[PDB]
Amino acid sequence: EELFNALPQPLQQLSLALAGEIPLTDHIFEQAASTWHVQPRSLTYKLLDHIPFSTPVVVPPSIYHSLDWSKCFAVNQDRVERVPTIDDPDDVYVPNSDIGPLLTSLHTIPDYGFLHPAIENDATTLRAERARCASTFYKIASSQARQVKLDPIRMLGFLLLVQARPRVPSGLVTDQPTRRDPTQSPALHAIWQVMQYYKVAGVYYAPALVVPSGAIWWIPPPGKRNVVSVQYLLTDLINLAILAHMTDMSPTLELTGVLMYLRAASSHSHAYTLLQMKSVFPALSLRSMYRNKGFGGKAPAIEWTEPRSKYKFRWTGVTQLHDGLRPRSPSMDVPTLEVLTKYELVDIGHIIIRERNAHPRHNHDSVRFVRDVMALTSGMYLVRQPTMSVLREYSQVPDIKDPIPPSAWTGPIGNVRYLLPSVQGPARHLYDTWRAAARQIAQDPQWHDPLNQAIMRAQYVTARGGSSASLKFALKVTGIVLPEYDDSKVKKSSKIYQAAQIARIAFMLLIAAIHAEVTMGIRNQVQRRARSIMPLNVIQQAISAPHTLVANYINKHMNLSTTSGSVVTDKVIPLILYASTPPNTVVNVDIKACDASITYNYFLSVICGAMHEGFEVGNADAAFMGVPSTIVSDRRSSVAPYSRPISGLQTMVQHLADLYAAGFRYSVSDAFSSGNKFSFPTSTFPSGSTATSTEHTANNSTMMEYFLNVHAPSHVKSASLKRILTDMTIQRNYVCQGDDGILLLPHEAASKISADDMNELLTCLRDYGQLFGWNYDIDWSDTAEYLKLYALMGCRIPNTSRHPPVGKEYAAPQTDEIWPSLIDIVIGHHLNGVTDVLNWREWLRFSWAFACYSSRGGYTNPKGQSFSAQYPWWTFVYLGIPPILLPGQTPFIHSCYMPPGDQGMFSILNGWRDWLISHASTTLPPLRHNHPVWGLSDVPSLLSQFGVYAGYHAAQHYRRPKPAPETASSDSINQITSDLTEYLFYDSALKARVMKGRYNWERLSSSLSLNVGSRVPSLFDVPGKWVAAGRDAEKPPPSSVEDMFTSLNRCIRRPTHSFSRLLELYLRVHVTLGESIPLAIDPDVPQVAGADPANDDHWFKYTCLGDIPSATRNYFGESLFVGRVVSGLDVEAVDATLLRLKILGAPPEAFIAVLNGIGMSDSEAHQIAGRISLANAQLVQIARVVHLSIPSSWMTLNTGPYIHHHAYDFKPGITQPSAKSRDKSIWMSPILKLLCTSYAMTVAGPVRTSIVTEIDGSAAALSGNLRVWMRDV
Amino acid sequence: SKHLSAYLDSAVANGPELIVEDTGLCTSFMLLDNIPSAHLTKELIGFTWF
RNA sequence: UAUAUAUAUAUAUAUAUAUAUAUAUAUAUAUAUAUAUA
RNA sequence: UAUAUAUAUAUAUAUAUAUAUAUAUAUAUAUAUAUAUA
Structure with missing residues (x-):
């Protein structure tokens, strides 16, 4: 491969290491990383010359047809709009224009350019139209190019490097070499052809270059001109090429994707063209x-247990497929082909259909084909001008087909109107439901509990926030002089900051401020319009409390929130799998725009009236959350009007209804556009975070229930449909979350419902939603779409396109981040490639290349010095990336499921133990006195020679700079603290409780001499945590950066030869693997697409363990003792401390002090403390006391039973008696089991039984040291 | 899958064709002119008539 | 001039039957290559 | 040379899919004729 010869020497070495030829070393690790940072990026394109492509792809010159930008922008009412070219009002995306004329030249790199300083000045100062339009166009065009985790060329370099040389085979009988090869990929050939246009003297000038502040462009010579769309096309091509290789798809499918992108790029508005024909691929396949x-x-044969509310499922065998079970819904070929005819791409459909027809039977090949084809949709994070986005989305109002007549209301109650009893229909159903829930909320001593009140107030504060300016104005307007704490370096717009200002003020004084402006934000998406973030101010968030509370009760006490408890997201996995099984028929539904359709004229007015009436049952004089009862005029009786008191809850409703009727008033301040901030109101619900899911899910469930039980039977025609439609209820036939929803039919007896009846049913539902202005957007294709998960016949399909390898969202014109953060990006990037099942061997190779580039970085002072550093490669091992080849071993023996942290280290060393010991003896002189785990052979020196310690400690170092304090600012720190504590401790009982608990605790901890300095979670530190978070949200000063680099280097250079005490002790255990466990399911049945004999290791791991989480006796430790806690503190810290105390045998008052330290009253503290026992605790619950946790990668596997009865901590016939844990086994055995299963999951291949065979020291010695360490921390 | 699908659904038609109906003549023997009669136009006129 | 109904012709779509072509799967025969045995 | 296994090609048979042609039925559109109304 002449390409391998083209690579520079260090990169050739790295490619050899990645191929498994040689063990990787820090030396070559640096040489590769360094040289990448010094050579120009164009050379990566230069590499493409040495590929003899043989693919039938032609790049039409139609691409280079820049449409003039000047006609794609205009300003009216002093705002820069997009003025769509086509008559379609949605063509609001980036056009296809030549950016060239708007470029100057840089002094550093003369070839590339940026915007004219003249243009931006005139747009800023003169507000000149054409200047502004040019600026806006330049900003957004640059931003669209910036939507990548790093420069695409680097990723292309990675792909070439790994693909430059075939990987060496392992000894495994299932290690199939790659079937796909280069010179056959249409994507790379396409990249070659298109890039031929961008060379002048064989130099291959890149069309653009991304920088921290966006992207720069190259000035074209007089002959040529660069269209911005070309850059986007390159990114899509590179992304597709990488994905196709990892997914190992046929070149034919990649060919179709190339033609797909080319056709889109040829026309104007590359983004818009792609967006229009988005769903073509999933529909076709x-x-x-x-x-x-x-x-x-x-x-699969999956059964749903009787208490369906619990969402518990059981795998119970397999089912033979036959023709009677084949899907009933019509295919999707006709509409898709009709659409494709518009863009004359019918060939793509013909190719796809013909290829699809080669899979008549459901097996691994079929699903693998489906996974690959569905991976062809564009993975670009689309971005448009926020001004257009906000103008296009919130300009919609629902259309009600039968409005509530005005005569249907009673007289006013000051603001609200009650609903007349004579009115029936869905509105009546909605009214009663909310009213009933309001009644239940009304009398509930769960509130007025001071602890619960603390939870709600604390829930309102986060590091982020908004609308602070509106807050300061509105209160200053009403004469309220708020405090300020600027010297305490914390952002004013943080929700924390405004909360501190409010702490002292009497609440009712603030009531006028709720009718204030709310700022807004935008977050881009991959396959849809960008999302919206609408953070209310703290006061508004407080007022809306009743709405949330009632919604929660509706959810938790009707259909059990339809999984909106979100306890572990994986509970939806078995649900959709069951929903997609042949015996069941499922229908996917979702509100078209629930945020935009919920409104006051129809919906909110009914809810407000119901809530206000529902609260009538209760003491009319009972303040709630500081809102006192007031007098309101009742005008229901025209003959006898009067005024009566109403409780605080009702007063909240009175204002809340007023606000909703007035409509939300947003203020847009988009930065990408130029000088165009404004404000306009809308009825669109905020729906900025999970706090909105409750309301929409409640209304979603309510309307569906009424439709099923009332509307449909009264209106449908088919008698058979009526027969089956009856005996059906939401609690066992329907689930939802926000707009999304799933409806599944009762099992038709050995048969399927006529598509005719389905059409009748689906039609009526559409009309039912049309009644009150809900577009239901339903579909029926015998598949499962719920929360962006896809299942086909009980097999999960990872939609890889939603996780593009190169794409990453950036919502601001600047990346605003520092180099070390890239490492975390790499780690998160790699995990997705594991979650989604890719070719695990090749994905690992690509991952390391990404890591190598990220391993190095530098920084420069705003005026002064530069700084630099880079990590030893062993860091990434600790961070959770398996090594490819260790010295003395064979490549590719470590599975991706290897746990991160100490567990991964221990498992690696455990397998590597004997070779290290023997080799150290030959190579090095013995150490001077005996070692617990090692002999005299002195492996630690060898590990240092491998730089293991350097990597091990380097990964421990922090990666974000720290802000500095100040003393007058500390007066503000105290002022910030005092007020935060004041806001937290509204009452006095909590303060007394915490103070008593803290005083007792330190007294006990010192006097009993457990230890001193134990950072125990307590409420007094919650404001401190808030303050730190608030200060951290600020852009750090350069000095902090310099401290980081210096500290990191010193931590790297410091010669240390020891791991953490825990890992040191963990090495004392010897673990061995026996035979394979009995299989969970039939290997024939596919469960996850791509986890097939081709992708062996995933196929092994899933087959042995089974996917369906089925903890029938374990419950995975979710029964934490402290169900109710305040924000800021960590439950996982609390229970760990409690168990640690219990193991240490602390006296009960120690538990009492700790519990009282987090607000628990003495009585409940005793009640809680009594529950603590080593018996009822679960394996993971107790094992976490030493930070032994379950890797996230395992969350999709049924590891419970294996850990329970397959990891023998003491097999009688194998273990040495020295390792017998004896009585301490009650808390020792879980630890050993966790270590065992971690090692078993580390190695590749099938899962085997794990057995402790020996502890070098006695098990007693191990337990004693552990108790010491537990006492120390 | 063929056998299983066959054994599970009996609505596969393939029933004997019982109903066949005739509206013509219930006969199976045809009277046939084997040797045509000669046409006479000069001598023996009138001995045959068509 | 227009609307409605009926008949006839032509075009398009859907269903069924027959013919031809192409693709895929399975079986059998023949040829060629590679491996093993004699 | 023969046997056995594997791969590829060609031929024949059977099944499935798609396309094209012809026939029949149904729907829609257009034209022409006839009737009725304006």
Whole structure:
């Protein structure tokens, strides 16, 4: 491969290491990283010359047809709009224009350019129209290019490097070498052809270059001109090329994707063109697979347990597939082909359909094909001008087909109107439901509990926030002089900052401020319009409390919130799998825009009236959250009007209804556009975070229930449909979360419902939603779409396109981040490639290349010095990336499921133990006195020679700079503290409780001499945590950066030869692997697409353990003792301390002090303390006391039973008696089991039984040291 | 899958074709002119008539 | 001039039957290559 | 040379899918004729 010869020497070495030829070393690790940072990026394109492509792809010159930008922008009413070219009002995206004329030249790199300083000045100072339009166009065009985790060229360099040389085979019988090869990929050939336009003297000038402040462009010569779309096309091509290789797809499918992108790029508005024909691929493949005759195969047999509210499922065998079970819904070929005819891409459909017809039976190949084809959709984070986005989304109002007549209301109650009893229909149903819930909320001593009140107030504060300026204005307007703490370096717009200002003020004085402006933000998306973030101010968030509370009660006490408890997201996995099984018919539904359709004229007025009436049952004089009862005029009786008191809850409703009727008033201040901030109101619900899911899920459930039980039976025609539609209820037939929803039909007896009845049913539902202005957007394709998860016949399909390898969202014109953060990006990037099942061997190779580039970085003072550093590669091992090849071992023996942290280290060393010991003896002189785990052979020196300690400690170092304090600012720190504590401790009982607990605790901890300095979670530190978070949200000063680099280097250079005490002790255990465990399911049945004999290790791991989490006796430790806690503190810290105390045998008052330290009253403290026992605790619950946790990668596997009865901590016939844990086994055995299973999961291949065989020291010695360490911390 | 699909659904038609109906003539023997009669136009006129 | 109904012709779509072509799967025969045995 | 296994090609048979042609039925559009109304 001449390309391998083209690489420079260090990169050739790195490629050899990645191929598994040689063990990786820090030396070559640096040489590769360094040289990448010094050579120009264009050379990566230069590498493409040495690929003899043989693919049938032609790049039409139609691409280079820049449409003039001047006609794509205009300003009216002093705002820069997009003025769409086509008559479609949605063409509001970046056009296809030549950016060239707007460029100057840089002094550093003369070839590339940036915006004219003249243009931006005139747009800023003169507000000149054309200047502003040019600026806006330049800003957004640059931003669209910036939507990548790093420069795409670097990723392309990674792909070439790994693909430059075939990987060496391992000894495994399932290690199939790659079937795909270069010179056959249409993507790379396409990149070659298109890039031929950008060379002048064989130099291959990149069309653009991304920088921290955005992206720069190259000035074209007089002959040529660069269209911004080309850059986007390159990114899509590179992303597709990487994905195709990792997914190992046929070149034909990649060919179709290339043609797909080219056609989109040829026309104007590359983004808009792609967006229009988005769903073509899933419709062609996923929605229509088995609509033929030769159907068959094996399918999972999943059963839903009787208490369906618990969402518990059981795998109970397999089911043979046959024609009677084949999908009933019509295919999707006709509409898709009709759409494709518009863009004359019918060939793509013909190719896809013909290829699809080669999979008549459901098996691994079929789903693998589906996974690959669905991976063809564009992975670009689309971005448009926020001004257009806000103008296009919130300009919608629902259309009600039968409005509530005005005569249907009673007389006013000051603001609200009650609903007349004579009114029926869905509105009546909605009214009663909310009213009933309001009644239940009304009398509930759960509130007025001071602890619960603390939870609600604390829930309102986060590091982020907004609308602070509106807050300061509104209160200053009403004569309220708020405090300030600027010297305490914390952002004013933080929700924390405004909360501190409010602490002292009597609440009712603030009531006028709730009718104030709210700022807004935008977050871009991959396959849809960008999302919206609308953070209310703290006061508004407080007022809306009743709305949330009632919604919560509706959810938690009707359909159990339809999984909106979100305890572990994986509970939806078995649900959709069950929903997609052949015996069941499922329908996917979701509100078209629930945020935009909920409104006051129809919905909120009804809810407000119901809540206000529902609160009538209760003491009319009972203040709630500092809101006192007031007098309101009642005008229900025209003959006898009067005024009566109303409780604080009702007063809240009175104002809340007023606000909703007035409509939200937003203020847009987009930065990408130029000087165009303004404010306009809308009825669109905020819906900026999970706090909105409760309301929409409640209304979603309510309307669905009424439709099923009342509207549909009264209106449908088919008698058979009526027969099956009856005996159906939401609690066992429907789930939802926000707009999203799933509806599944009762099992038709050995049969399926007529599509005719389905059409009748679906039609009526659409009309039902049309009544009150909900577009239901339903579909029926015998698949499962819920929370962006896809299941087909009980097999999960990872939609990889939603996690593009290169793409990353950036919501601001500047990246605003520092170099070390890139490491965390790499770690998160790699995990997705594990969550989604890719070719695990090749994905690992690519990951290391990414890591190598990220391993190095530098910084420069605003005026002064530069700084630099880089990590030894062992860091990434500690961070959770398996090594490819260790010295003395064979490559590719470590599975991706290897746990991060100490566990991964221990497992690696445990396997590597014997070779290290023997090799150290030959190579080095013995150490001077005996070692606990090692002999005299002195492996630690060898590890230092490998730089293991350097990497091990380097990964421990922090990666974000720290802000500095000040003393007059500390007066503000105290002022900030005092007020935060004041806001937290509204009453006095909590303060007395915490103070008593803290005083007793330190007294006990010192006098009993457990230890001193134990940072125990307590409420007094919660404000401190808030303050630190608030100060951290600020951009750090350069001095902090310099401290980081210096500290990091010193930590790297310091010669240390010891791990943490825990890892040192963990090495004392010897673990061995026996035979394979009995299988969970039939290996024939596919469960996750791509986890097949080709991708062996995933296929092994899933097959052995089974995917369905089925903790019938374990419950994965979710039964934490402290169900109710305040924000800021960590439950996982609290229970760990409690168990640690219990193991240490502390006296009960120690528990009492600790519990009282977090607000628990003495009585409940005793009650809680009594529950603490080593028996009822779960394996993971107790094992976490020493930070032994379950890796996130395991959350999709049924590891419970294995850990329970497959990891033998003491097998009688194998273990040495020295390792017998004896009585301490009650808390020793879980630790050993966790270590054992971690090692077993580390190695590749099938899961084997794990057995402790020996502890070098006695088990007693191990337990004693552990108790010491537990007492120390 | 063929056998399983066959054994599970009996609505595969393939029933014997019982109903066949005739509206013509219930006969199976045809009277046939084997040797045509000669046409006479000069001598023996009138001995045959068509 | 227009609307409605009926008949006839032509075009398009859907269903069924027959013919031809192409693709895929399975079986059998023949040829060629590679491996093993004699 | 023969046997056995694997791969590829060609031929034949059977099944499935798609396309094209012809026939029949149904729907829609257009034209022409006839009737009725304006």
